């Protein structure tokens, strides 16, 4: 319906926006950072969802408030570890706070048992963990809470090029991975063109936001660490 149309159209506004990693890592205290001109795979989705959730008459204050709700655990900014780094946690936040529906949760009987530990296992890869034993301990606790839970997903072999009727334009796609200790590796926005299910996403290879040149199914097939998808939908 209209919400999916609006998610998609707001995503399309970002075509050609450059890909830049680490845009949220300002030094100093964790605070809301808005950089809509340079995005990564996750920040793209966050800005699109924030805008689409904000009633169009957008209001900067309203946009900011929605972004904060999306990006931080229960919208409460409280250090680096309050940012929802793991997508399973990001999803849980949106479901709990009423602005996401877990579509694969309803529509796919396949499940996986979360095993999340990557960040605390590899703190050298993250500035706010590398020298904060306190943040590492809070990430461990977060990881322990997340792990052991079953979530539904769609295995990649079960996704056709032309999609599935229960995946709709504007849905948020979280690409599941077999990387040890990590649940999700990439994200984007579902877009049907000429009966192919494509992905609008921030591509690090193309260095910008693109419409995928191959269907989402082929994107998954091509990548040996990508296992499938979770499908989430804005609830407004």
Please indicate, yes or no, whether residues 108 and 197 belong to a single structural domain of this protein.
yes
CB atoms within 10 A of CB 83: 18
Neighbour-count burial of 70, counting CB atoms closer than 10 A to its CB (0-12 exposed, 13-18 middle, 19+ buried)? buried
Please indicate, yes or no, whether residues 136 and 211 belong to a single structural domain of this protein.
no
Please indicate, yes or no, whether residues 43 and 132 belong to a single structural domain of this protein.
yes
Please indicate, yes or no, whether residues 58 and 134 belong to a single structural domain of this protein.
yes
The H-assigned helical ranges of the chain are 2-12, 41-53, 60-71, 87-96, 103-107, 118-121, 127-130, 133-146, 216-222
What's the structural domain count of the chain?
2
Distance CA 230, CA 181 (A): 17
Please indicate, yes or no, whether residues 108 and 203 belong to a single structural domain of this protein.
yes
> CATH number for the domain including 189?
2.30.260.10
DSSP assignment of 185-198 equals EEEEEEEEETTEEE
By C-alpha distance, which of 104, 106, 136 is closest to 228? 104
By C-alpha distance, which of 74, 92, 75, 72 is closest to 83? 72
Please indicate, yes or no, whether residues 2 and 75 belong to a single structural domain of this protein.
yes
Resolution attained, angstroms: 1.1
By C-alpha distance, which of 84, 63, 103 is closest to 145? 84
* Cα dist from 75 to 50, 64, 117, 147, whole Å: 12, 11, 23, 22
Please indicate, yes or no, whether residues 24 and 73 belong to a single structural domain of this protein.
yes
Tokens of 102: 């877990």
Please indicate, yes or no, whether residues 39 and 156 belong to a single structural domain of this protein.
no
Please indicate, yes or no, whether residues 124 and 224 belong to a single structural domain of this protein.
no
Please indicate, yes or no, whether residues 105 and 128 belong to a single structural domain of this protein.
no
Tokens of 58: 């957008």
Please indicate, yes or no, whether residues 136 and 185 belong to a single structural domain of this protein.
no
> CATH number for the domain including 17?
1.10.3670.10
Its domain, for residue 80, covers 1-100+115-148
Please indicate, yes or no, whether residues 155 and 110 belong to a single structural domain of this protein.
yes
Experimental method: X-ray
Neighbour-count burial of 20, counting CB atoms closer than 10 A to its CB (0-12 exposed, 13-18 middle, 19+ buried)? middle
> What element of type H or E holds 75?
none
Distance CA 166, CA 104 (A): 9
């Amino acid at each position: 319906g209209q919400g999916g149309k609006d998610m998609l159209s707001n995503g399309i506004k970002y075509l050609d926006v450059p890909y830049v990693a680490h845009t949220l890592e300002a030094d100093g205290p964790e605070e809301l950072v808005i950089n809509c001109d340079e995005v990564d795979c996750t920040t793209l989705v966050e800005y699109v969802l924030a805008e689409t959730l904000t009633p169009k008459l957008i209001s900067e204050s309203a946009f900011a408030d929605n972004l904060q709700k999306i990006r931080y655990r229960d919208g409460k900014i409280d250090g680096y570890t309050s940012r929802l780094h793991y997508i399973a946690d990001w999803i849980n936040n949106g479901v709990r706070n009423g602005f996401l529906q877990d579509v694969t949760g309803a529509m796919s009987p396949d499940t996986e048992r979360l095993s999340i530990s990557y960040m605390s296992s590899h703190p050298q890869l993250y500035k706010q963990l590398a020298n904060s034993p306190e943040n590492v301990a809070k990430m461990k606790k977060i990881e322990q809470s997340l792990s052991g839970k079953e979530v539904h997903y769609l295995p990649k072999a079960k996704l056709p090029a032309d999609g599935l009727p229960w995946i709709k334009d504007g849905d948020i796609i979280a690409i599941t991975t077999n990387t040890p200790g990590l649940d999700v590796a990439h994200m984007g926005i579902a877009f049907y063109a000429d009966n192919k299910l494509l992905l609008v996403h921030a591509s690090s290879t193309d260095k910008k936001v693109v419409v995928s040149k191959v269907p989402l199914s082929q994107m998954l097939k091509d990548n040996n660490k990508w296992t499938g998808i979770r499908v989430l939908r804005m609830k407004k």
